A paper describes a structure:
The focus of this work is Ribonuclease P (RNase P), the only ribozyme other than the ribosome that is present in all three domains of life (see for some reviews). While in archaea and eukaryotes, RNase P is comprised of one RNA subunit and four to ten proteins, in bacteria, this complex is formed by an RNA subunit (P RNA, 350–400 nucleotides, 110–125 kDa) and a single protein (P protein, ∼110 amino acids, 13 kDa). In all species, the P RNA serves as the primary biocatalyst for the cleavage of the 5′-leader sequence of pre-tRNAs during tRNA maturation. The P protein, on the other hand, binds the distal 5′-leader region of the pre-tRNA substrate, enhances the affinity of metal ions, and assists in product release.
Author numbering: 5 to 115
The structure:
Amino acid sequence: AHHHERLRLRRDFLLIFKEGKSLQNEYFVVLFRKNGLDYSRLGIVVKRKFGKATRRNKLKRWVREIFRRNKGVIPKGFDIVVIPRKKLSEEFERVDFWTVREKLLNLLKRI
Ligand SMILES: O=C1c2ccccc2C(=O)c2c(O)c(O)cc(O)c21
């Protein structure tokens, strides 16, 4: 079999929101639910208010990279939805990739 990491977000966002668990810090909410697979999958939901397209797309690239490159510390078998918060929006231009990575991994490790 091949390697997959993308979540069926349109299909499953409501399910994960309702039936999943959640963790949060000042920058992110993470929703997660067991997926019956031997790997975890990621969806990213960025509210329009987070910023214009370029900023939203940058956040998405960052989060995808963090998920892709740190699977050794991210529990397996979960569908995971990452939602950036207003405070991250407010501080986004003052923080770097590595700061965002620390804050996201802190949550993903606790699933
Ligand atoms: O979706 C959620 C969410 C879902 C389940 C539990 C808590 C939250 C939550 O606390 C939250 C925020 O604080 C926020 O600022 C934007 C959000 O989108 C959420």
